[PDB]
């Protein structure tokens, strides 16, 4: 029953993101935290490269529009500075 979980903003599969799969399964009995799970390290690597891609594409879009606005402003300056003499 995962369409319900999509209604609530959860992962459609309870083995997705969230507290069942991302907290560590075990600790030491002293209370020392375990070394991290292999799948959680892998998964954090995937999420980080995804975030880097979001930032990278966003910045290329913004730099793209700024460079276009310089080309338009300099076209208009080349219009007004050639209507003289």
């Amino acid at each position: 029953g995962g369409q319900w979980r999509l209604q609530q903003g959860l992962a459609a599969n309870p083995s997705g993101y969230g507290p069942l799969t991302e907290l560590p399964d075990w600790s030491y009995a002293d209370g020392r935290p375990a070394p991290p799970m292999k799948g959680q390290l892998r998964r954090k690597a995937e999420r980080e490269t995804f975030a880097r891609r979001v930032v990278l594409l966003s910045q290329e879009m913004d730099a793209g529009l700024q460079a276009w606005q310089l080309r338009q402003q300099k076209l208009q300056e080349e219009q007004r500075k050639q209507e003289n003499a």
Partner: protein
């Protein structure tokens, strides 16, 4: 002869609904085609110069004295 159940119609329909929303989100680009031009030419060129560079840097590995002599250890014995 094969006939169409309610499962098949409801499945077909939910695919049609995903499709219609794909039509919606493709109807409003962030840039025009004039604005996007060359906005990523540098990164594409550097990426291909990396592909090109890994292609043209292919050569036999270094050979070492220590490996060849290290084969002598197959008759290491005790005393």
């Amino acid at each position: 002869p094969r006939f169409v159940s309610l499962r098949a119609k409801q499945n077909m329909i939910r695919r049609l609904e995903i499709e219609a929303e794909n039509h919606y989100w493709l109807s409003m680009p962030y840039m025009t085609r004039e604005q996007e031009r060359g906005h990523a030419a540098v990164r594409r060129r550097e990426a291909f110069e990396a592909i090109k560079a890994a292609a043209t840097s292919k050569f036999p590995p270094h050979r070492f004295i220590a490996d060849q002599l290290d084969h002598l250890n197959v008759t290491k014995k005790w005393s």
